[PDB]
Design a protein around this ligand. Structure first.
Ligand SMILES: *Cc1c(COP(=O)(O)O)cnc(C)c1O
Ligand SMILES: *Cc1c(COP(=O)(O)O)cnc(C)c1O
Lengths: 394, 394
């Protein structure tokens, strides 16, 4: 199959939440502008998936649908071959998206007033899943040194000792800083977790999007006792740009926890009957491996394009390479602009639409998250607009 | 076009909930057997839909997607053209299925211990939506005389006086009895509702599947004040056999009720991001009207086959014609077999898989619901199989 990561596509007036958001923020945005905000790709989906879905549409009946044993086997096989992770078919529980699964986790395993620990700054829906259900957000801020983010273990161990805290909501790879947790880091966290009564909710939706050289370790794969009280969220959506196919594979080893998560889901959302969602995931894992390799190559090229751009044109702004995800963390703090001013400038002066750093927590103030999943030429067009805007800003 | 309502299809090992349930119940079931239980059709989807979805796939990106204004106008046009019902586009709230919407209504407009009135026997998920959320199921049993079901207005009024009951969860057309409510019946229910603090939740998922000779009336369309406190559940799933596309259109006129409903949805399932869900509904409404006409004819043709079948071979068993839906209600109380025992007989001796009447409430004990949405030849095969089983039964 021949893949395309070069065609500049347009998603204007097509129901794209990302594009509609851009036009809503700046009605005067040029027609040549492409948003680099929300985490979905500016690439057509894998050809095999599209051809596969069309083939399926000619065979199937779009009725009440559930996962086939083959589907489960395919997900189990992906975890094995791609992550040296041994799971069983009956460990897989499906939800229409990871966020709803997270909301469900909080709903079922905690009560109002209970605390949930998250490492910040981080993917904003985490905050929502907690406080929106009246639970307490317990922040364990990341330590940062010259752009490199690490875990505050002393503080984390302290928080785990607080009986009111019922679980650790973990992001791995960690959005938006692009960290792919090292084995030693995961070991320290594992010890803290097993030492307390904390449950482990590990969101590893970005675990297939790792940059060259780095290695992802499925958290619950390093210890069976840890796995006994862990809920791991996975899905093919971020990997193959199918967030609009709504299908997630939540892995839960413990029968008691699994059955509680399922009961709760069945009272809110219910079981996913989306036939194409099941098939899309199967097709991706079975046939879209080569496409993913090519996608990662382009992303790696793009993070280097960004890094180079600032080293050459505006050295005080830092865009370090990331370890995972296709979301790069750019440090604009040297501009000495508060986050509201930055946002205003990016949207109206540079017409570059990032996911403003501050939305991920106060630790993101001064930073900008750029979506690298676009053609290199598109990234270049955007940086040049920024270039002229920054120069004008003088 | 050439619409196929004759090809006997097989959905074995394809993830069909209906078929898998069948095999689970009778591993020895013959390969010639087709289930007539779960409410999805044993027909392939509308040609226009399939060609439209394939075309859409060649042009779209499967990312985070929301409804377009065109989508909304199309939903509005369908209500206007097909039901003489004037709705506004901002009245439309989307969910991934009607059942989740019902759970949402119960969770947001009532509290634990509150009562929700339902007219039984009825679609079983209704019971679950209430009971599994710690709410009280308040049954208002339908009156039955020679097969025809009517509303017990006296009981409904009595129950409406209990301030603990917060709403009436209505099914129109009514599954599983097949009643399409007359304006006279709806007006009488309305007066009872308007004189109380009862909210109205009208599940009208079957309102496009009306048999010749009858006409559905959207409940909230008969009175503006009733509409002010009514939540109407609609979707294209039952109509075009796309329960596997996960897209429902919940119509809520009142701004405050709507806002609350949406808030409740966002705290549990969030909005549907399904790209194909929105497109499938728009295609069906715009291009699949003729297919639907052909489908209803076969359903009408089949219900008459069932009716005549019993009158000729087992007249003590009654299967009267229905007014709406494609689910026919059969009275098997003349066999004097307790339900659990009768189910056993149907599953193993006759190898006919109905939706056992008792599952819809005690009022269904002794009845069987047959899915008419299948090729006429398939209905005949099934009936002939039960015929032998019945005779041998003696
Ligand atoms: C994108 C993203 C999700 C995905 O939600 P889906 O609805 O399953 O696509 C969950 N977690 C993080 C950390 C993400 O960045
Ligand atoms: C089939 C049916 C539904 C459809 O539910 P979905 O969640 O949209 O599949 C809802 N209500 C009744 C009365 C039905 O018979």
């Amino acid at each position: 199959m021949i893949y395309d990561f070069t065609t500049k596509i347009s998603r204007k007036n097509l129901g794209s939440l990302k594009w509609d958001l851009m036009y809503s923020q700046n009605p005067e945005v040029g027609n040549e502008v492409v948003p680099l905000s929300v985490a979905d790709m500016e690439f057509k989906n894998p050809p095999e998936l599209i051809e596969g879905l069309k083939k399926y549409l000619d065979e199937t009946v779009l009725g009440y649908t559930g996962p086939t044993e083959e589907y489960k086997k395919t997900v189990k096989k992906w975890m094995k071959d791609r992550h040296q992770w041994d799971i069983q078919t009956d460990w897989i529980i499906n939800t229409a998206g990871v966020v709803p699964a997270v909301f469900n986790a909080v709903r079922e395993f905690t009560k109002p007033g209970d605390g949930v620990i998250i490492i910040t700054p981080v993917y904003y829906p985490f905050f929502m899943a907690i406080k929106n259900q009246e639970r307490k957000i317990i922040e364990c801020e990341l330590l940062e040194k010259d752009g490199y983010y690490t875990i505050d273990f002393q503080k984390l161990e302290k928080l785990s000792k607080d009986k009111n805290n019922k679980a650790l909501l973990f992001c791995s790879p960690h959005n938006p800083v692009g960290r792919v947790w090292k084995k030693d880091e995961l070991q320290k966290i594992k010890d803290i977790v097993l030492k307390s009564d904390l449950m482990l909710w590990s969101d590893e939706i970005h675990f297939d999007l790792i940059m060259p050289g780095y290695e992802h370790t499925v958290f619950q794969s390093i210890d069976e006792q840890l796995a006994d009280k862990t809920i791991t969220f996975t899905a093919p959506s971020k990997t193959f740009n199918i967030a609009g196919m709504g299908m997630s594979n939540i892995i839960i080893k413990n029968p008691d926890i699994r059955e509680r998560f399922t009961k709760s889901r069945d009272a809110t959302s219910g079981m996913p009957f989306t036939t194409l969602g099941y098939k899309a995931c199967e097709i991706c894992y079975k046939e879209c491996g080569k496409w993913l390799d090519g996608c990662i190559k382009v992303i790696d090229k793009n993070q280097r394009i960004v890094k180079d751009f600032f080293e050459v044109n505006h050295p005080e702004i830092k865009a370090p390479l990331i370890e995972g995800t296709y979301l790069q963390w750019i440090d604009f703090r040297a501009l000495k602009m508060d986050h509201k001013a930055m946002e205003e400038f990016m949207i109206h002066k540079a017409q570059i639409f990032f996911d403003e750093g501050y939305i991920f927590g106060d630790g993101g103030i001064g930073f900008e998250r750029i979506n690298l999943a676009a053609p290199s030429s598109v990234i270049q067009e955007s940086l040049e607009r920024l270039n002229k805007a920054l120069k004008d800003l003088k």
